Amino acid sequence: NEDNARFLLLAALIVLYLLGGAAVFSALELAHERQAKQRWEERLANFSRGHNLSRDELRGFLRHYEEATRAGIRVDNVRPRWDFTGAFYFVGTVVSTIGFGMTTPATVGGKIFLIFYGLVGCSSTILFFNLFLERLITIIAYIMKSCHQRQLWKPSVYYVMLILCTASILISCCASAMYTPIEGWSYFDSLYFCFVAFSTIGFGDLVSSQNAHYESQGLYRFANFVFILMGVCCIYSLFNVISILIKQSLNWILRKMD
Amino acid sequence: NEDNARFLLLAALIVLYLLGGAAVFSALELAHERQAKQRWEERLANFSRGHNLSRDELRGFLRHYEEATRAGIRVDNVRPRWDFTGAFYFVGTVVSTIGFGMTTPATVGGKIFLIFYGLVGCSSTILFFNLFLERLITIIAYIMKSCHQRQLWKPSVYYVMLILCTASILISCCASAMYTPIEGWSYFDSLYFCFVAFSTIGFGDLVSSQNAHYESQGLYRFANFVFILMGVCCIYSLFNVISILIKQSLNWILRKMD
Ligand SMILES: CCCCC/C=C\C/C=C\CCCCCCCC(=O)O
Ligand SMILES: CCCCC/C=C\C/C=C\CCCCCCCC(=O)O
Ligand SMILES: [K+]
Ligand SMILES: [K+]
């Protein structure tokens, strides 16, 4: 049946996409990993020699620092993790499935409660993004009909994709223009953070709204909430729309394979 | 219009869900954060006093260790990040949007390439999970019809939810029974990892398949790939099904509000 042929074809194409990506990423920056690890080994050797410290004592101390960093210590001045604001940021990253993982539950009660809270929250949010998308399609259809009348049916998926690309770029550039002066990131690092957050990938190498102090903290936190919400809804809509164009491309490939 | 009333009602309910979660999590484990941070300050003081080291030199050394850990050093013996196997794990976490973030791109070329690779990969995968769900619904309908004939229409959403709960528990218990002896995690930590991976939240506090060596590495990596794939597809299906039951509950609340 054609639905099974589509499913197996898509699985094969995704597996080839993973093998191709793995072949590319290991070529771009395996050299950088090995340089940074060599430079670390040189720094650790210099520290060992300079202070008459054995690698045993240093490995013990660094094991304690690995424990402390999971509790949320940093050498930079970082906001408390489980004040009400930090917990609100945490639940925001759970419920959107971004999961930066700078804050993570540590008690068994927290671990248990997460499994139910994330279970209902993530379902409620995937509902929210589907209602958002249906509203956005309705708004675009209304505007396009008003333009058709102003020149005196629903929009096609390609023009919706071109609209959502424009929205995603405009939000991402505004967010980058906010994070660049406030967080001190480079502009390109802030664009990369914007994509990593809005796609809900969320590695957590960069996280906004973390220093112990900012000018106008409340306004900055509110703007960060608004920008992350708008970005996630726009890029998740873009993912759905591209997924529909992929499905149509698979149906075309299977038709041409007839 | 009823669609706007549903959208605004769901936004209000989600905002109250975030405020309630933030109020709960900050109560469960703010005491643990402050204990672990005090114990760290005590360890750092003991190390400073014991080796005649100033907090300036130690802060410098720890800043270098924060740089080295982002390049993927650990005190434990950890697998190279950007060999072909590590890059395949990375792209697996990008394309599923899990994003554990133990491996992250560091060159500008890697950061650029991620924005296009994740853009097409995540759309292709959200397509894959929607084809998976349509196939699973078709299989459940066929089996239920065969049972109706064996007792000699599509299934209702509630029984699909009860099936997907059972599948998610059975996969999660099998995965936990694999990770517990091999990774040395506690059983409950491995269940929590299973949920955090399968929901695609992916904090990255726990990550499987990371030590420099295992018995039967190839079989273990293959089993880890299979279990994470099956888990993500089952729990993402469960999220969709619960989101439909939420939508029906909102429609009921709006009807009763008439
Ligand atoms: C009004 C509708 C709300 C819908 C919410 C749904 C999903 C949540 C999505 C994104 C929010 C999480 C990002 C961080 C927010 C807190 C930022 C801060 O405090 O610094
Ligand atoms: C056959 C169909 C494949 C579909 C793939 C789609 C999405 C990918 C989802 C999950 C895989 C990522 C988890 C880690 C895999 C590598 C594990 C390892 O190497 O240790
Ligand atoms: K994620
Ligand atoms: K993460």
Numbering used by the authors:
A (entry chain B), B (entry chain A): 14 to 165, 190 to 295
Quote the paper.
THIK-1 (KCNK13) is a halothane-inhibited and anionic-lipid-activated two-pore domain (K2P) K+ channel implicated in microglial activation and neuroinflammation, and a current target for the treatment of neurodegenerative disorders, for example Alzheimer’s disease and amyothropic lateral sclerosis (ALS). K2P channels are a distinct subset of K+ channels that assemble as dimers to form a pseudo-tetrameric central pore. Recent studies have demonstrated that THIK-1 can be transiently activated by both Gi/o- and Gq-coupled receptor pathways and directly activated by anionic lipids such as phosphatidylinositol 4,5-bisphosphate (PIP2) and oleoyl-CoA17. The overall fold of the channel is similar to that of all other known K2P channel structures; it forms a domain-swapped homodimer, with each subunit containing four transmembrane helices (M1–M4), two pore helices (PH1 and PH2), two selectivity filter (SF) motifs (SF1 and SF2) and two extracellular cap-forming helices (CH1 and CH2).
Here we present a cryogenic electron microscopy (cryo-EM) structure of human THIK-1 at 3.16-Å resolution in combination with a detailed functional analysis. The SF adopts a near four-fold symmetry and is similar to that of most other K2P channels, but the intracellular M2–M3 loop (Arg166–Gly189) is longer than that in most K2P channels and was not resolved, presumably owing to its conformational heterogeneity. However, the structure of THIK-1 reveals a major constriction within the inner cavity that is created by the interaction of bulky side chains on both the M2 and M4 helices. Also, the Y gate is positioned slightly higher than the X gate, thus creating an even smaller inner vestibule below the SF in THIK-1. The Y gate completely occludes the permeation pathway in THIK-1, so this conformation is predicted to be closed and non-conductive. By marked contrast, the structure of THIK-1 revealed an unusually large number of positive charges, mostly arginine residues, distributed throughout the cap domain, several of which are the KIS and sit directly above the filter. In particular, the R83 and R87 side chains from each subunit position four positive charges directly above the filter and the S0 K+-binding site, likely influencing K+ permeation through the filter itself and also the extracellular exit pathways that they line. Because this binding pocket is also highly curved, the bound lipid is likely to be a polyunsaturated fatty acid (PUFA), and we found that the omega-3 essential fatty acid, linoleic acid (18:2), fits well into this density.
